[model samples]
Target: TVAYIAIGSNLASPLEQVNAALKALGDIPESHILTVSSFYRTPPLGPQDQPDYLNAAVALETSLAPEELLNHTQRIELQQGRVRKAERWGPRTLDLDIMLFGNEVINTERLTVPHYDMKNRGFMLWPLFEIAPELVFPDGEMLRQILHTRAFDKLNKW
Candidate 1:
């Protein structure tokens, strides 16, 4: 199955964190990273007091099931020192979200494929568009089309 994931970091060296997360993802068994979008610096979302974030998206092919993939993401977060003590959407060392898992719609206690808030999050859409402009939601909406309403600014290349 193919999967799209968004990675971001605002604490520590954001670029390095992003790079490290990519490496970690690539290291997972049965997973191959197909493409990575350039990093972007965006204003913080949710809480108003946190620092801005450096975000990007990665498209990959993975044989792992959705729950297994989620476990792998959480493992990477722990390996990178991601602490959950902060407020929601607060700054972090690394954040890895499973944005899409093929065309499947999964709603379970532990995971939600085609992430529930992806369309509404500029940080997810812009970078995702950069890597996969032809991507479409299961409902047949082009990613670029959905990105049109969001505000995102590209940052220096990583």
Candidate 2:
């Protein structure tokens, strides 16, 4: 199955974290990263206490299920010093999310495909759209349709 992964970071050399994450994703068993978007610096989600985020997305061909993919990402994060904290959209060493899994809209205990926030987040949307503009949601809406509604004019290339 083909999947999309969103990567973001704002702590401790974020560019390195995001780069290391891409390397780590390529190491996942039975998976291959097809392509990745250029990093972008976007507004923080909350608190704004840290530097702007470096965000990008990658398209992957993987044999792992969504939850398994999540596990792979989480493991990579932990290896890079990511710790779950209480801060909402707080600073992190890394953030790995499954932005989309083929055309499936998954809602499970451990994962959500096409990601719950893909549309609302400019950080994720711009990258995903750049790589896969024709990507669609389970509800039959084109990703470009959603992108049109968003104001990503302020996003800066990193």
Candidate 3:
């Protein structure tokens, strides 16, 4: 399966944390890193008090199932000092999200692919566009169609 993973960090040297996560993704068993995007700086989605986040995305070719891949991603998050917080979108050391999994729409108790509300997230969509320029969502929407000029204004390449 080809998977696109979104990486983000807003605490504890976010640029460094994001880079470390990219390295860790390459080390996942049964997975190969296909491409990575340049880092981007974006404001927090939930709260205005937190620092801006450093975000990036990667494409991976993996033999693991979606659930198994989610395990690896979550493991990477924990290894990088991520705490399971009750606050939605609060500041975090790291966050690893499975943005897409081979055109599959997954809605398991633990994960959601084509990832939940990604269209509204410039941090997720822009880096993904860099790595997978020709991507088309399962709904037949091209990546370009989802990216608006307003969203680009908030995305600063890092």
Runs off by more than 4 Å, candidate 3: 45-48, 84-91, 148-154
Candidate order by TM-score, decreasing, is 2, 3, 1
TM-score for predicted model 2 compared with the true structure = 0.88
Task: Report the lDDT tens digits of candidate 3 across residue range 41-152.
Answer: 8766655566787889999999999999999998888798656377646544788889999999988889888898888877888899888878999888888877854445
Q: In candidate 1, what are the lDDT values of residues 27-146, reduced to their tens digit?
A: 988999999988888766567566777889998899998899999999998898556575555544788999999998898999987799888877788788788888889878888777
Candidate 3's TM-score = 0.87
Query: What do the candidate models score in CA lDDT, each in turn?
Result: 0.83, 0.82, 0.84
What tens-digit string does per-residue lDDT give for candidate 2 at 24-46?
99999989999999889886665
TM-score of each: 0.86, 0.88, 0.87
Q: After superposition, how far is residue 128 of candidate 1 from its true place, in Å?
A: 0.6
Q: How many backbone clashes does candidate 3 have?
A: 0
Number of clashes recorded per candidate: 0, 0, 0
Runs in model 1 lying further than 4 Å from the true structure: 45-49, 84-92, 149-158
Worst 10 residues of 1 by lDDT: 149-158
lDDT of 1 at 34: 95
